[PDB]
Structure formats: C-alpha cells, structure tokens
Amino acid sequence: EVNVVMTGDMTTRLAFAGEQLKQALVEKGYEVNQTTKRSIYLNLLNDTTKKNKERFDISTKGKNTYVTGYDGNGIIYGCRELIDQLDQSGTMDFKPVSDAPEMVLRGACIGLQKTTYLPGHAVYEYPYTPESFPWFYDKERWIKYLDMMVENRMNSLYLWNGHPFASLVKLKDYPFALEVDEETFKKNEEMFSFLTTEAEKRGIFVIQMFYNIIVSKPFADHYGIKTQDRNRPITPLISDYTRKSVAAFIEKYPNVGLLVCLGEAIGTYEEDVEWFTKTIIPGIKDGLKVLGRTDEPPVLVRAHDTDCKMVIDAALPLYKNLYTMHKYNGSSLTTYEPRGPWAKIHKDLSSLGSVHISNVHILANLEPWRWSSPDFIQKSVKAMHSVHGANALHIYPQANYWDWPYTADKLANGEREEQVYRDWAWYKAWGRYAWKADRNRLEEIKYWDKQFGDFYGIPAEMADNIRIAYEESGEIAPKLLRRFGITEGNRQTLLLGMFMSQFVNPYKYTIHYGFYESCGPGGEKLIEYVEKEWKKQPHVGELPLDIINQVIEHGDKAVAAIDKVVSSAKKNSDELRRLQNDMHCYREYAYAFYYKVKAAQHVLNYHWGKNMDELDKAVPLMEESLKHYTKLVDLTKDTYLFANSMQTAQRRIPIGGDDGNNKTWSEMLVHYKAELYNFKENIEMLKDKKVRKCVEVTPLKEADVKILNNLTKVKIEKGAKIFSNIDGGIDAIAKEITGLTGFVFNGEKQRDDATTIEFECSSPVTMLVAYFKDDHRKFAKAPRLESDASANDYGQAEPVLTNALHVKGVALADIYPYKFKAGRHTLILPKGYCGVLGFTEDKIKERDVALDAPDWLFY
Numbered sequence: 001e002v003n004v005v006m007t008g009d010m011t012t013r014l015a016f017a018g019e020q021l022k023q024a025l026v027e028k029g030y031e032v033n034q035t036t037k038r039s040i041y042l043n044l045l046n047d048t049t050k051k052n053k054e055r056f057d058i059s060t061k062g063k064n065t066y067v068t069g070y071d072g073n074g075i076i077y078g079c080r081e082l083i084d085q086l087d088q089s090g091t092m093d094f095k096p097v098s099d100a101p102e103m104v105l106r107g108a109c110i111g112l113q114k115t116t117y118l119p120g121h122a123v124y125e126y127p128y129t130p131e132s133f134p135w136f137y138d139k140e141r142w143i144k145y146l147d148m149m150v151e152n153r154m155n156s157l158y159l160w161n162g163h164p165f166a167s168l169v170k171l172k173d174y175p176f177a178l179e180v181d182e183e184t185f186k187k188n189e190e191m192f193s194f195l196t197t198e199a200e201k202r203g204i205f206v207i208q209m210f211y212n213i214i215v216s217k218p219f220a221d222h223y224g225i226k227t228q229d230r231n232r233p234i235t236p237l238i239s240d241y242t243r244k245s246v247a248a249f250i251e252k253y254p255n256v257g258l259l260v261c262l263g264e265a266i267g268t269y270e271e272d273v274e275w276f277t278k279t280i281i282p283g284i285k286d287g288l289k290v291l292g293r294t295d296e297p298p299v300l301v302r303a304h305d306t307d308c309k310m311v312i313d314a315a316l317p318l319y320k321n322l323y324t325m326h327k328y329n330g331s332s333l334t335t336y337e338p339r340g341p342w343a344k345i346h347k348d349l350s351s352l353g354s355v356h357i358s359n360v361h362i363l364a365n366l367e368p369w370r371w372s373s374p375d376f377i378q379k380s381v382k383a384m385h386s387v388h389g390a391n392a393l394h395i396y397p398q399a400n401y402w403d404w405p406y407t408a409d410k411l412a413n414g415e416r417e418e419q420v421y422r423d424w425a426w427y428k429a430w431g432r433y434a435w436k437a438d439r440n441r442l443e444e445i446k447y448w449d450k451q452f453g454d455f456y457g458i459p460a461e462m463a464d465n466i467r468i469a470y471e472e473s474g475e476i477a478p479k480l481l482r483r484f485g486i487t488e489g490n491r492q493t494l495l496l497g498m499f500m501s502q503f504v505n506p507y508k509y510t511i512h513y514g515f516y517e518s519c520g521p522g523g524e525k526l527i528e529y530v531e532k533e534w535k536k537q538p539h540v541g542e543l544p545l546d547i548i549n550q551v552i553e554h555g556d557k558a559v560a561a562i563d564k565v566v567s568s569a570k571k572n573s574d575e576l577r578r579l580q581n582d583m584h585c586y587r588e589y590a591y592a593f594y595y596k597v598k599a600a601q602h603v604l605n606y607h608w609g610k611n612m613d614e615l616d617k618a619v620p621l622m623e624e625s626l627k628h629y630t631k632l633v634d635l636t637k638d639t640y641l642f643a644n645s646m647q648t649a650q651r652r653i654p655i656g657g658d659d660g661n662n663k664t665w666s667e668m669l670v671h672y673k674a675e676l677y678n679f680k681e682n683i684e685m686l687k688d689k690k691v692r693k694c695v696e697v698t699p700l701k702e703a704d705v706k707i708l709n710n711l712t713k714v715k716i717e718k719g720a721k722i723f724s725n726i727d728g729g730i731d732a733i734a735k736e737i738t739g740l741t742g743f744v745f746n747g748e749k750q751r752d753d754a755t756t757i758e759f760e761c762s763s764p765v766t767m768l769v770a771y772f773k774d775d776h777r778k779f780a781k782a783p784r785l786e787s788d789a790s791a792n793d794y795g796q797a798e799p800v801l802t803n804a805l806h807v808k809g810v811a812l813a814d815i816y817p818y819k820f821k822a823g824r825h826t827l828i829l830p831k832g833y834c835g836v837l838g839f840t841e842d843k844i845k846e847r848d849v850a851l852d853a854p855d856w857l858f859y
C-alpha cells in the first residue's frame, strides 16, 4: 500500500526519519514495507557546504515521492514536512517543497534550578540528584520532550545549572569535590548517555550551561572558602579546579556543547576576560587535545553580566568558533519593535558574522498565566532579524521556569498540570517562526485555527475564537510592563499588580537606563505625561492613557472570544475551562490596572496643582481598582498556587518575596486594602489639620561594633578625608550620617583589590555604604539584582539615603544599607572607589537628601 525506501549510508538520524514516517503512515490506515505501487524514497547526501545545512527537497513523479536531505537534520525535517502535510490535508499527494530553516540554532531550556535555595548552597547551586529532580531520571518524560522538540524542528536543548560539573565528573586531584553519592553519579552518567543518544537521533544538540565563578560545597568546605562570592579575586586553586573540571566534562561528553555565563559571581569585566581566556578556554582545549580533536566545536557565550564585545575581542585569537547569546527584551517579553541601546549590543554581537542567539528569558511579566500569541511571536522573530540581526533562538519556559516540569496551575487534590501539555503552542509558534518568519498572516490564522481546533476537538472556524483570546490577551502583559513597569527583571512579578507609590514615584523603586529606551516604541511614563500636561509641553510617542484604553479592550475581546467557544470542546475540555479563567483573570487585572493608573494621574495632578478635588477623585477609582482585584482573587484562589516562580527576596516589586511570601493575589489584596485605608486616613487629616507626614531627620546613633581587619577609622562630618589619595574632604553630608565612625581607604588600592570589611556586632546593625553616582569605571557600581542574584543578600538592593554624600572633586553618593545579625562577618564590596560611613543599630528612614515626593499619601 505504501513503500518507504531508505538510500545510502545509514546514520541514526536517517533511521529516525524512517521510524517517524512509518508511525504516521500506519497511524492513518496504510500498510508499509521498509528497505534499502506508491513509494517514498528517503535519500541522504554528504554535503559539507555550511549553506545547505538542515535543508531538504521534496519532489513527486508519478507514484514516487523523493525526499533529499542535504544532511541528517535535513532528512528528519524532510520527513516532518510529509507528516505535517498528511496531518493538515486528507491526502498522501505531497506539494513539492524546497526548504531550510532561517535560524540555524532553534532551542529551549530546562533549569535544573528550584523555586528556593537549598540548605548550605547559594543561588543557582543544585547538584543533579533524584531527591531534588526526580523528573530528570524519567526516560518516558525525556522522549515526550524530545519528540515535541523534533515536531517543532528545534535542534538544541540547554540545561541550566550553577555548577553542574561536581555532579558529572571525578578529578583525581580533587576527589572530595564530588557533590553526589556513587549511585547518583552512575544515574547522572546513564541519564546524559540516554539524553545525548536520544537527542542525536532527532538532530538535537545538547548544551550544558554554567555560571561563574562557582565551586562545589565539599570543595569549598575543605579549603575554607565560599562556593561563590561575586567580588572575590580569581586564585590559582579555584582556576585549577574549574579548568580540570571543564577538561573532564569535554573528554567524557564530547558531543555536549557549553553555554558560558561569565557571571554572576565575577566582580569586573577584566576578571570576566581573565576567567574565559585563562581558565575556561585552556580547559576546553585540554579536553579536545585528549580526544585528539584538531577541530574547534562551537562554544556559546552570554552577554549577561559582562562586556560581550571586550570578551570575544579578547578570546578569538585563542578560539575561532564563538557564538553569542543576549536577552530579547531583558528578562521579559514586551515588544516586537525593540530599539535603543540594547538593540545596538545585539547588532554589534550579530555583526561578527557567526551565530547570535536571541534568548527569550524568564518571562517575569507573563508569569503564571497561559500565553502563546502567534502574531506577537511572529512579529518578534521578525524584529530579531531586522533590529537585532540574530540568526538563532533560545527560549525559556513560558512561565514557572524555577518549578519544572510543572505549571503554577492548581488542579483538584494536588494534581500538578505539566508544562509540555499546557504550553504546546508557545513551543510550536517559536519553532514555526524560527524556521521561517515571513508567512502569509491570513494563511497563518488558518493553520492556528486547525491547531487549536484539533487539540480541543472543535471545527477550525469556531476555534478561531481561541486564537483571538491568545492574540488579544497576549498584548496586555507586554504593553503594561514596557509602559508602567519598574523593570524587565524577575525582580518584578507584573501580574500581582503595582502600588500607587510605584505609579506616582517610579524612580524610587530604581529604574536602570536601557529598559524604557530598548523594550518598546519610545513614549512617556505617566509622571512624564502629567508633568507635560501641567507645563503645556507636547506629547511624543506611546502614551499611558492610550495603553490602559487598548489593554482593557484587549481584555474585553479575549473574554468575549473564549466565552463563545468553551462549551464546544470534545477534548481537553478541562484545559479549555482553565484558558477561559485565565482570560477573565487578564480582564479583571486589566480593569484593576486601568482604574489604578487613572487614580495615579489624579494624585500626580494634586502633586502639581494641590487641588483637593484631585485627591477626592482618586478614591472612587482606587475602590473600583480594588473591586476588580477582589474579582481576580476569586478566579486565582482556586486555580493558581502562586504567580512568581522565583520565590525569594530577589523579588522586590510589588513588594519583597522574602521566604516565599507575597506570591499570591490573596496576600496582595491584604496590602492593596491597607494602601486605601492609609490613603483615606491621610486625605481626612489634610482636610481637618492641613498637615502631611514628612521625614523627621535625626542622627543615626553609632552601633557598638568592633573591627577585626585593622581598618583606619575617621569621624564622618564636613571635611573628613574618606579617600587618603585625594586632597578633597566631604563638602555635603546628610544629618543622619554626621557623628558616625566610618573608614579611610586608598581609592587607587580599591580599583586593584576591592574592600574587605571584617567586624563583630553584639546585636543587629546596618553598615552604611556610599556608591558614587558617576559612570566613570573607577567607582564601584551599586548592587543590581538584574545582573547579580546576591545584590539583596544584606538587604542592599535599593538605597536608603539618595544624594546624601558629596566629596570635593569626586562626586555625589547614594547610601545603601548592608543589614547583619549579631555575629561575626566578612564581606568584600565591589572593586572601585566607594565609602563606608559606619554602623547603626537604629531604624533607617528613606530620604532624598536633595529635597515631599507625591507618595507619602499611601504611607
């Protein structure tokens, strides 16, 4: 009934192509004969030309269909086109196709990472064990993932871990380094042997990613060092262990690629370069040299928390075959019109003429609801080509990265909804448009009508309503985040909401340059719009009141769309009901958000004109916002375990996610309610007493601290020299700080060596640390969660006293707090000029010393 002939040299990938073509033929009637009436010839060439990689031709000639694969991936993707054409038409006549993928690497990532740190381990550190990661040892579950990967014609799988080597390689010189028992090493060995075998037959490259500088805890416990400390120098020993470990990994897993992050535990770009050129690359060559390999297989290097151009500039004489990675829209998905300074980084990395991989990273602003908008994804990949000059793709899970393999969805009696079931369209869209981006958009709505229809057992025409829900709801998180968001970072969980404070005083919640300038069409923040209204300047670009208008029409339409289609389902009906609850969530969130912003404008108008009417107007709008948030909670309280999957104190917006708190809509309603109580109390006091609450400014009393590493003390007051190497003393100093006992360091010595403070305290203290506001690189940069997970370990992420210190012929400084228990402490501050102004047991009150900001009405 149907012959399937396989021609030439076997190879695992030709076999697999045949295995898959057989399955689908039988799976639809049709009897078969395999070999070397109606025939399909699978032909495979040897073709070196880097031009025809992953390419296939399909022609037909009477009763005989021919698939030419220019290489192993090519024949696989040839057989995929037959199968898809079969899946979409009745028939077994085949439309001729001559085709190759546009993007040369197309791939996705699984974090061997957890929602929370692990006792005795720092951020990103999770040994490969069945205790932490049962799912990693499940072969049934790997074949399901890999088949989804091949079906979407993705050719790369990236495993993300802080320090994977201690789980996978033994070193004679460091045999105590090992982070797993003997039985767990054997299973790691079996599971990588099986992963790479099974990925290979499917044309999938397996890529192990690691951060730096991180060592094993046993390695650390023995030598007396930490597993990781961002600002600690490179040492021969840590270097020797990392080098031998990579040499080992290469020898043992010759077909597994490496994705290097030169972060987040390396303090300067120079140390970033020393590490890659003197430790990693020498290590990769040790392995190649043992394997007797003349060639240089590609090594992948991220832009994250390094100077991408500096590091490739430095490395290419040592190793030709570098590929680069950079985030698409930072740690979120905001636009298909990215631009500005982040575009240029992409574009310089891209203008090497190698591979440059767009990382759709973390999707903080999508967590945790269903998101898979064909149109948004198509337009995005097109921007990757035209703006960013990317020619490859790496994609995170749509949501719940940190909790693989499960979505955050709450099912009856503790059943966990799985991520490969829920987010199929996500993987299928990125995969589709990575293969070919320019596809007739109307032709595309038919294909997606049938994809959503097949899955729910609905006709395509009725299923078009499912596509609208996805494309209408899909614009909401991106628009709100680029236009009102504090950060593209997972330091923010957009879909829990924002306080009025964060709408009327965004700069107080720290907004790094490059976010608003890159992750959307230009346009005004709410404070800029309102400042423009009161000063009668014209408005330029994308405006906040337009967006909230767009965003509630997105909500209304997505709801009207899914509500038509939801009871038609012959299949996955329970899932379709969770999609409908999701769209009602996005609608109530949109309306909550709309009314809140509207109220914020009204409080900003009070800021500029001091009309009381303005504040009165805000109350009804805050009530209505709260109504819609109360409606959100009913929908979420029985359908979601949480929103954010990073459930640590690295989550700062809308508030701390310390110890896993403040990770549900229910918890947030408690704080949003309090918000309005305070507001209506503050209004009432204005209307009786005509007084507001403002900071009372009192000196911080000096803690009873002893210093263990013989620092020089200085009193902090106008004139004190906190730098020994400049003649300039202090010429401005916040009243809070004067009196305190701080330290004198050599700024030159701080560039080369940093700043170790070693002290004991008999009750809890805050150390006050001055970071100078100056792009000159001689200055230590302030802590920054976006680049550095440990930047809130002492509660130092955001500053307490801004514009609080000036030294003559240096700069202005913000004061940051480093909070410590009673105990004995060592801490290395970033290389560069910086101040240490002393220690207080006292409560610290946030103040902009320059100044009364519009957001005391909420406190």
Ligand SMILES: O=C(O)[C@H]1O[C@@H](O)[C@H](O)[C@@H](O)[C@H]1O
Residues within 6 Å of the ligand: 304, 331, 361, 362, 489, 490, 491, 646, 650, 785, 786, 787, 788, 789
């Ligand atoms: O890019 C990275 O690896 C990191 O980026 C940080 O900003 C984020 O908070 C981390 O959880 C991690 O995703």
Ligand code: NA
Residues within 6 Å of the ligand: 085, 086, 089, 090, 091, 092, 093, 094, 095
């Ligand atoms: Na057909």
Ligand code: NA
Residues within 6 Å of the ligand: 127, 179, 217, 218
């Ligand atoms: Na351990």
Ligand code: NA
Residues within 6 Å of the ligand: 302, 303, 304, 325, 326, 327, 359
């Ligand atoms: Na990246």
Ligand code: NA
Residues within 6 Å of the ligand: 633, 636, 637, 638, 664, 665, 666, 667
């Ligand atoms: Na809830």
Ligand code: NA
Residues within 6 Å of the ligand: 647, 648, 649, 650, 657, 658, 659, 660
């Ligand atoms: Na925490």
Ligand code: NA
Residues within 6 Å of the ligand: 705, 706, 707
């Ligand atoms: Na002392």
Ligand code: NA
Residues within 6 Å of the ligand: 808, 809, 810, 811
């Ligand atoms: Na000056």
Ligand code: NA
Residues within 6 Å of the ligand: 819, 820, 821, 823
């Ligand atoms: Na402590």
